[PDB]
Design a protein around this ligand. Structure first.
Ligand SMILES: [Zn+2]
Length: 203
């Protein structure tokens, strides 16, 4: 499938707010060859890109749900196909992107022809990166309700589910001494994130 020419031009419209000279975090949930949640975050401006994708490898998705994102696969059946490839194509040229663990972000961008994107690796330890975790969830819990399952960590203690958006927000908080003052606003309209079908009309 893919996005129509009108959607691609609308996506091109929404991508203009991103300041290409501002700090931009990027995190994904799921493997880079088969991602299911993608998030970009500019803390200075408050603009964030957030959308989902149906997985190709169902066997690996179940493992990632048990030990990371805890997403029910049935909640990803109405996503817009091809949005990931289109958003990556529409990112500004030679944009610099910040991430905790730059390996998987680099693989996703190179697999989509965007070798021009510069990446900076913030190497924070596992428990250091998620110090603001409870504070980020309490402030922006209404921005993602997709994480419904119980996530555990092998040696089987239950943990908070990993969200691509909340990760970008809490990672920037760890290197900035706290949450940014800017209020978040979504770059992408909801009609492009979820392929919504016409419901039955009550006559
Ligand atoms: Zn999420």
């Amino acid at each position: 499938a893919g996005l129509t020419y009108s959607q691609l031009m609308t996506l091109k419209d929404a991508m203009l707010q991103l300041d290409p000279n501002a700090k931009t975090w990027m995190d994904i949930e799921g493997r880079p060859e088969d991602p299911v949640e993608i998030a970009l975050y500019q803390p200075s401006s408050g603009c964030y890109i957030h959308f989902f994708r149906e997985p190709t490898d169902l066997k690996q998705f179940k493992q990632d749900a048990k030990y990371s994102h805890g997403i029910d696969v049935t909640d990803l059946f109405a996503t817009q196909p091809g949005l990931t490839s289109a958003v990556i194509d529409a990112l500004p040229r030679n944009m610099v992107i910040t991430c905790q663990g730059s390996d998987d972000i680099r693989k996703l961008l190179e697999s989509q022809g965007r070798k021009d994107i510069k990446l900076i690796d913030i190497a924070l330890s596992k428990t250091d990166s998620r110090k603001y975790e409870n504070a980020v969830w309490d402030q922006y819990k209404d921005l993602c309700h997709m994480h419904t399952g119980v996530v555990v960590e092998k040696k089987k203690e239950e943990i908070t589910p990993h969200c691509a958006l909340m990760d970008c927000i809490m990672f920037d908080a760890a290197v900035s001494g706290g949450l940014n003052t800017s209020v978040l606003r979504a770059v992408l309209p909801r009609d492009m994130v979820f392929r919504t079908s016409t419901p039955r009309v009550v006559l």
